[PDB]
Design an enzyme around this catalytic site. Structure first.
Site, PDB file in Angstrom:
ATOM      1  N   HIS B  41      28.855 -11.425 -26.339  1.00 17.08           N
ATOM      2  CA  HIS B  41      29.454 -10.244 -26.941  1.00 17.08           C
ATOM      3  C   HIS B  41      30.775  -9.680 -26.821  1.00 17.08           C
ATOM      4  CE1 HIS B  41      28.340  -8.871 -22.648  1.00 17.08           C
ATOM      5  NE2 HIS B  41      29.499  -7.711 -22.655  1.00 17.08           N
ATOM      6  N   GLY B 143      33.205  -2.922 -17.328  1.00 17.51           N
ATOM      7  CA  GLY B 143      33.817  -4.798 -16.999  1.00 17.51           C
ATOM      8  C   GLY B 143      33.651  -5.703 -16.226  1.00 17.51           C
ATOM      9  N   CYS B 145      31.255  -7.831 -16.539  1.00 15.17           N
ATOM     10  CA  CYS B 145      30.215  -9.315 -17.426  1.00 15.17           C
ATOM     11  C   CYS B 145      31.512 -10.330 -17.254  1.00 15.17           C
ATOM     12  CB  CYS B 145      30.455  -8.453 -18.900  1.00 15.17           C
ATOM     13  SG  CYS B 145      29.196  -8.013 -19.542  1.00 15.17           S
TER      14      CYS B 145
HETATM   15  C1  LIG Z   1      29.352  -5.634 -19.476  1.00 16.97           C
HETATM   16  O1  LIG Z   1      30.234  -5.675 -17.982  1.00 16.97           O
HETATM   17  C2  LIG Z   1      29.457  -5.970 -20.557  1.00 16.97           C
HETATM   18  O2  LIG Z   1      30.777  -6.793 -21.264  1.00 16.97           O
HETATM   19  C3  LIG Z   1      28.514  -4.953 -18.591  1.00 16.97           C
HETATM   20  C4  LIG Z   1      27.389  -4.970 -17.577  1.00 16.97           C
HETATM   21  C5  LIG Z   1      27.312  -4.046 -16.611  1.00 16.97           C
HETATM   22  C6  LIG Z   1      27.780  -2.588 -16.733  1.00 16.97           C
HETATM   23  C7  LIG Z   1      27.769  -1.598 -15.514  1.00 16.97           C
HETATM   24  N1  LIG Z   1      27.422  -2.185 -14.716  1.00 16.97           N
HETATM   25  C8  LIG Z   1      26.943  -3.767 -14.909  1.00 16.97           C
HETATM   26  O3  LIG Z   1      26.999  -4.596 -14.915  1.00 16.97           O
HETATM   27  N2  LIG Z   1      27.706  -5.479 -19.784  1.00 16.97           N
HETATM   28  C9  LIG Z   1      26.809  -4.408 -20.726  1.00 16.97           C
HETATM   29  O4  LIG Z   1      27.323  -2.947 -20.337  1.00 16.97           O
HETATM   30  C10 LIG Z   1      25.694  -4.731 -21.423  1.00 16.97           C
HETATM   31  C11 LIG Z   1      26.932  -5.424 -22.891  1.00 16.97           C
HETATM   32  C12 LIG Z   1      24.879  -6.569 -23.690  1.00 16.97           C
HETATM   33  C13 LIG Z   1      24.859  -7.200 -22.943  1.00 16.97           C
HETATM   34  C14 LIG Z   1      25.649  -5.776 -25.114  1.00 16.97           C
HETATM   35  N3  LIG Z   1      24.843  -3.940 -21.684  1.00 16.97           N
HETATM   36  C15 LIG Z   1      23.772  -3.624 -20.664  1.00 16.97           C
HETATM   37  O5  LIG Z   1      23.778  -3.947 -19.079  1.00 16.97           O
HETATM   38  C16 LIG Z   1      22.946  -2.126 -20.576  1.00 16.97           C
HETATM   39  C17 LIG Z   1      22.899  -1.437 -21.756  1.00 16.97           C
HETATM   40  C18 LIG Z   1      21.607  -0.592 -21.682  1.00 16.97           C
HETATM   41  C19 LIG Z   1      20.736   0.724 -22.430  1.00 16.97           C
HETATM   42  O6  LIG Z   1      21.250   0.240 -23.699  1.00 16.97           O
HETATM   43  C20 LIG Z   1      21.394   2.130 -24.030  1.00 16.97           C
HETATM   44  C21 LIG Z   1      19.925   1.018 -21.761  1.00 16.97           C
HETATM   45  C22 LIG Z   1      19.695   1.644 -19.959  1.00 16.97           C
HETATM   46  C23 LIG Z   1      20.080   0.602 -19.412  1.00 16.97           C
HETATM   47  C24 LIG Z   1      21.118  -0.879 -19.756  1.00 16.97           C
HETATM   48  N4  LIG Z   1      21.767  -1.729 -19.611  1.00 16.97           N
END
Ligand SMILES: *[C@@](O)(CO)[C@H](C[C@@H]1CCNC1=O)NC(=O)[C@H](CC(C)C)NC(=O)c1cc2c(OC)cccc2[nH]1
Ligand SMILES: *[C@@](O)(CO)[C@H](C[C@@H]1CCNC1=O)NC(=O)[C@H](CC(C)C)NC(=O)c1cc2c(OC)cccc2[nH]1
Lengths: 303, 305
Positions: B41, B143, B145
């Site tokens: 992603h 940040g 991921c």
């Molecule tokens: C990565 O850094 C994305 O590059 C990030 C992980 C976190 C963010 C905060 N703490 C972490 O570990 N990942 C995300 O933001 C992911 C992205 C996905 C893979 C496309 N999304 C989530 O973690 C996420 C989305 C949602 C949501 O919707 C709206 C509703 C509730 C929880 C939630 N978590």
């Protein structure tokens, strides 16, 4: 989100650990520039360690009496001195992986990362707090002497601890990198007791804020307390008194959560007088005191 | 002595962490030989992440749309492919710090060290267990991921986890280094919920052998049990069933103490049915389930890498 006991990445320190052997005695040393630092009791035999006159034992040693191995390479000792309980072995080669570094003395209640080593090889890393009675609750076995504790700010490694001993109660003691012990301990082979241990109050409160940031609020209450009335109760439970400096350092966590520090003190006082009724906080059944305010801010800022 | 949650020394992984950017989207990758591995992603805009078609989104991209940086040094991308939810990017420089390594997919209950990273810079290290509901109780900010989990055997680093997601409940979810999620999650910007969690029985047993090794053995009873009977009872307490592999990995601790696995199970069964009775084990009145038998061995025996 989430809160976990976390250590600094330890690669910069890994590249400094070496093995130091004198006679039948082996432990870890720290190789920075052309000096290797290790606990001085390495020069002792079993009989010497009972009551070592270190200055006597040291003058009778030669450079070739010290076997220093860095991985496969053996480093040639070209000089040896003592700074309190730390032996300084001069070598003919400067460690090329020497990071920017400083030697600091940590204060009680502050945390640091420990890189536990055996035979000069890093084995594990974890965070510790300097207890008020100048011990630390580590995980150290035979051969772990010479392991070091440290923090990192930017690219600078601040070394604060070198490990020397395990008290009969199973907690651990050691020196700063200038060879001064934390606490009233001595590097002789005797059973030694620490002072009465107290609980680090500012850290417990920081960890209660962490629990709130992470959605745990069951221990909160509507009451407030004065600073002095809080300290009267805290001292009664062998907690350190909370100073105004400590109140201030908690400011960021108060702002983020909207719970005034003296409000959170009223919760802790209720917890100390009532217990936790089998409930848990951040997964723990006890009140955790090894997280500083800054440990909490750096994991929970923005959550 | 002492018992702590201990991570592996993480130097060999720090030397492999990089930053990957596509447009304004940035996260962490893993630089091994001349390939960089990262969450796919990174190719999404914020709005793309709501309902992405990764195949469609990737067809649009060329090698020159990918910014890979080791510190402030760019590694030119010379090839790219997608494997499940991981992107692989071939680069023109083989990482001189690459360690001996392998990719592994771990089981629920197994632990691993997590190197938390931001913008390609390692920031902290800590130990995690894969929960039975395939989440990890992590500590991860925006940040993070592309942060990875790993174990170290001899001189070999076994990579087992790449970070992708934070659930509503505050726990974390991700993939192995082949891009296959642990658990039923997907990489999409949606609130997803994990199954009910359970206690990791093999690790509670490990912790009990730990206690015995330390002279704390009040809980040993004179009973034994079959593995099937224990499993059926353990499930009524929200404990995970034991496998044959679980019995086998408890072997060393069983031999060290002279207490057969099924005897320890009968002791744990009593602890579940009657409670602790105002007593503790290794200082705690809570049974601990995030130490594997190898963790217990490694820490009571000082193994090095
Ligand atoms: C990565 O850094 C994305 O590059 C990030 C992980 C976190 C963010 C905060 N703490 C972490 O570990 N990942 C995300 O933001 C992911 C992205 C996905 C893979 C496309 N999304 C989530 O973690 C996420 C989305 C949602 C949501 O919707 C709206 C509703 C509730 C929880 C939630 N978590
Ligand atoms: C270092 O590895 C020695 O090189 C070792 C540290 C530990 C051993 C077990 N767990 C550890 O962390 N340190 C020692 O063995 C020190 C050596 C001194 C400083 C010369 N000794 C002790 O830690 C020690 C001695 C005694 C004792 O005597 C008699 C009686 C009771 C406890 C005790 N601890």
């Amino acid at each position: 989100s989430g809160f976990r006991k976390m250590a600094f990445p330890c690669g910069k320190v890994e590249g400094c650990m070496v093995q130091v052997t004198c006679g039948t005695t082996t432990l870890n040393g720290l190789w920075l520039d052309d000096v290797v630092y290790c606990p001085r009791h390495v020069i002792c035999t079993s009989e010497d360690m009972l009551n070592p006159n270190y200055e006597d034992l040291l003058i009778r040693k030669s450079n070739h009496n010290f076997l220093v191995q860095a991985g496969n390479v053996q480093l040639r000792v070209i000089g040896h001195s003592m700074q309190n309980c730390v032996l300084k072995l001069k070598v003919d080669t400067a460690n090329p992986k020497t990071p920017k570094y400083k030697f600091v003395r940590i204060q009680p209640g502050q945390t640091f990362s420990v890189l536990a080593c055996y035979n000069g090889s890093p084995s594990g890393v974890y965070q510790c707090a300097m207890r008020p009675n100048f011990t630390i609750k580590g995980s150290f076995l035979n051969g772990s002497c010479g392991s070091v504790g440290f923090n990192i700010d930017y690219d600078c490694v601040s070394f604060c601890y070198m490990h020397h001993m395990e008290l009969p109660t199973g907690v651990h003691a050691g020196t700063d990198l200038e060879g001064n012990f934390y606490g009233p301990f001595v590097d002789r082979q005797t059973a030694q007791a620490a002072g009465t241990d107290t609980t680090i109050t500012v850290n417990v409160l920081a960890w209660l804020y962490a629990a709130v940031i992470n959605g745990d609020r069951w221990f909160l209450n509507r009451f407030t307390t004065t600073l002095n009335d809080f300290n009267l109760v805290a001292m009664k439970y062998n907690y350190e008194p909370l100073t105004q400096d400590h109140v201030d350092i908690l400011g960021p966590l108060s702002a983020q959560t909207g719970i005034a520090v003296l409000d959170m003190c009223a919760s802790l006082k209720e917890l100390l007088q009532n217990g936790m009724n089998g409930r848990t906080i951040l997964g723990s059944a006890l009140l955790e005191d090894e997280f500083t305010p800054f440990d909490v801010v750096r994991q929970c800022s923005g959550v």
